[PDB]
Amino acid sequence: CGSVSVAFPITMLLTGFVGNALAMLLVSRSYRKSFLLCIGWLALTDLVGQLLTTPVVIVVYLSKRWEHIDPSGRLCTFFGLTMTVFGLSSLFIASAMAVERALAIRAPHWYASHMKTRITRAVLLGVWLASLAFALLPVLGVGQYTVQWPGTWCFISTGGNLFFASAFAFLGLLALTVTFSCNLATIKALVDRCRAKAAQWGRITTETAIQLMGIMLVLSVCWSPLLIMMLKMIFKECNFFLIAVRLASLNQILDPWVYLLLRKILLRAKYG
């Protein structure tokens, strides 16, 4: 019972709150560019997901059974839905930003003059409503949310329960595929411009390349074990699945740092 400890949810709630609050504080001070707008609501998305989820886990620990706390399973269905909504939201808000950076450097002339904040609100609103619509399936009969080991959290049941558990996994793999494909394309598109002009111009490219590669590293470390393990169960088992959902939750903790806060700490054929 090494993983059964309230020290993890309490630590994850405090670090997630502080990181996401500092991010929302800086964006309110600076503006409202669209990149600042998308990061501000991404930090707000991750924080709400942590406040709606973690306090329930702490109560179950300090009380010592989910069944006697939740008769009829009213709270468990809400818990599993909130896990699915905010999990997919972070995955696809990041995928949207990957397409933004790809189309920005591909055409800085048209992007710097035709990008509007009304498009940013449309993409943020579309991801929210689409992810909520998918999480409503177990309430509508397609899928089921059940209590997971060790009785302190609810998630998608893995054994049309197997179809719904498979639709979530491929959606996550899709979000990582779009994010990794656009970032690698942006890195190559950025280095080619640096090699055509050839310390200011080359310094920005390497700093931006580290930014894109770091995003891929966090996502692949945090989300891969959970998505892969779900696929293995559809087609120690209780123990490793708890570590995986905690690693997936870590991605929403590291989000404000990989996008905004680390840049601020390090901020501040000679022009070359």
- Among the residue ranges 9-17, 28-36, 45-53, 152-160, the one whose residues contact ligand POV (CB under 6 A): 9-17
Give 89-151 as a DSSP string: HHHHHHHHHHHHHHHHHH-HHHHHHH--HHHHHHHHHHHHHHHHHHHTHHHHTSS-EEEETTT
> Contact 89/7 with Cβ under 8 angstroms?
no
Q: Are 180 and 216 in contact (CB under 8 A)?
A: yes
- Closest separation between CB of residue 11 and ligand POV, Å? 4
CA–CA separation, 260 and 272 (whole Å):
27
Sign for the CA dihedral angle at 24, 27, 32, 35 comes to: negative
- Min separation Cβ 62 and ligand P2E, Å: 12
Interface with ligand POV (CB under 6 A), residue from 131, 253, 259, 260: 253
14 or 189, CB closer to ligand POV? 14
Q: Which range binds a second copy by CB under 8 A, 127-135, 139-147, 170-178, 263-271?
A: 263-271
Angle at CA of residue 38, ends 34 and 44, nearest 5°: 145
Indicate which of ligand P2E, a second copy, ligand POV, none lies near residue 10 (CB less than 5 to 8 Å, by partner kind).
Answer: ligand POV
Residue 21 binding result from ligand P2E, ligand POV, a second copy, none, given CB thresholds of 5 to 8 Å by partner type? none
Question: Rule CB under 6 A: which of 233-252 touch ligand P2E?
Answer: 242, 245-246, 248-249, 252
With vertex at residue 86, the alpha carbon angle to CA 214 and CA 263, rounded to the nearest 5 degrees, is 30
Q: In the complex, which residues of this chain contact ligand P2E (CB under 6 A)? A: 8-9, 12-13, 16, 46, 49-50, 53-54, 57, 83, 86-87, 152-153, 242, 245-246, 248-249, 252
